[PDB]
Write a protein that binds this ligand. Structure first.
Ligand SMILES: Nc1nc2c(ncn2[C@@H]2O[C@H](COP(=O)(O)OP(=O)(O)NP(=O)(O)O)[C@@H](O)[C@H]2O)c(=O)[nH]1
Ligand SMILES: [Ca+2]
Ligand SMILES: [Ca+2]
Ligand SMILES: [Ca+2]
Ligand SMILES: [Mg+2]
Length: 166
C-alpha cells in the first residue's frame, strides 16, 4: 500500500488538531491544548486504494514551533488551515506557504487551503476571498468544521488527490 505523508499547518487556534482528531478518531475536541508535534496513522480506502495516511499535526504558536522546519521536510502534501472567524490567520497563510516552499525547496508542492470553523456565524473571511488566494497558488479551497464533521474527510482526501496529481 502507498503511504501519504500529510502535514497540517497554520496559526495557533485555527483547529488543526481538532480537524486531524475528527478525521482519525471521530470526535470533536472542545478544549484548547496547544500542540508541539504529534503524528497520527490510519489505514483508509480512498478512491479504491487502501493507503496509510501519516498525518503530522504541527504547532501554530511561536513558543511551541521549535522543530517545525525539520518535521515538515518529509511532508508530501500540506493542509494550510485558517479559521473563517480569524482574519489574521488568513493573512498569515502566505507565510506558511513560503515556509513550505523553503522546506521542500520547490514551487510545486501539493497543498489544499482550508477555511475551518464554518459552523460559526462570526465570519470575517468570505469564501470568495479564500477562493482567490487558493486560485493564485493553483490549489483548491475547502471549508470545514471540526465540530460538525462538514468537509473534514473531503479536505484530507482532496489533499491525497493533489499528491496523486504530482
Ligand atoms: N466551533 C468550532 N470550534 C473549533 C473548530 N475547530 C477547532 N475549534 C476550537 O478551537 C480551539 C482550538 O482548536 P485546536 O484544534 O486545538 O487548534 P490548533 O490549530 O491545533 N492549536 P495549536 O496551533 O496551538 O496546536 C479548540 O477549543 C477547538 O474546540 C471548528 O471547526 N468549529
Ligand atoms: Ca469533545
Ligand atoms: Ca485584525
Ligand atoms: Ca472583510
Ligand atoms: Mg494543535
Amino acid at each position: 500500500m502507498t503511504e501519504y505523508k500529510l502535514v497540517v499547518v497554520g496559526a495557533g487556534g485555527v483547529g488543526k488538531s481538532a480537524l486531524t482528531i475528527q478525521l482519525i478518531q471521530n470526535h470533536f475536541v472542545d478544549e484548547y491544548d496547544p500542540t508541539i508535534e504529534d503524528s497520527y496513522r490510519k489505514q483508509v480506502v480512498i478512491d479504491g486504494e487502501t493507503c496509510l495516511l501519516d498525518i503530522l499535526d504541527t504547532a501554530g504558536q511561536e513558543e511551541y514551533s521549535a522543530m517545525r522546519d525539520q518535521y515538515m521536510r518529509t511532508g508530501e502534501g500540506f493542509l494550510c488551515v485558517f479559521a473563517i472567524n480569524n482574519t489574521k490567520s488568513f493573512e498569515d497563510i502566505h507565510q506558511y506557504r513560503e515556509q513550505i516552499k523553503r522546506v521542500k525547496d520547490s514551487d510545486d508542492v501539493p497543498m489544499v487551503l482550508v477555511g475551518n470553523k464554518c459552523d460559526l456565524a462570526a465570519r470575517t473571511v468570505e469564501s470568495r476571498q479564500a477562493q482567490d488566494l487558493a486560485r493564485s497558488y493553483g490549489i483548491p479551497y475547502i471549508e470545514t468544521s471540526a465540530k460538525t464533521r462538514q468537509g473534514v474527510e473531503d479536505a484530507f482526501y482532496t489533499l491525497v488527490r493533489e499528491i496523486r496529481q504530482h
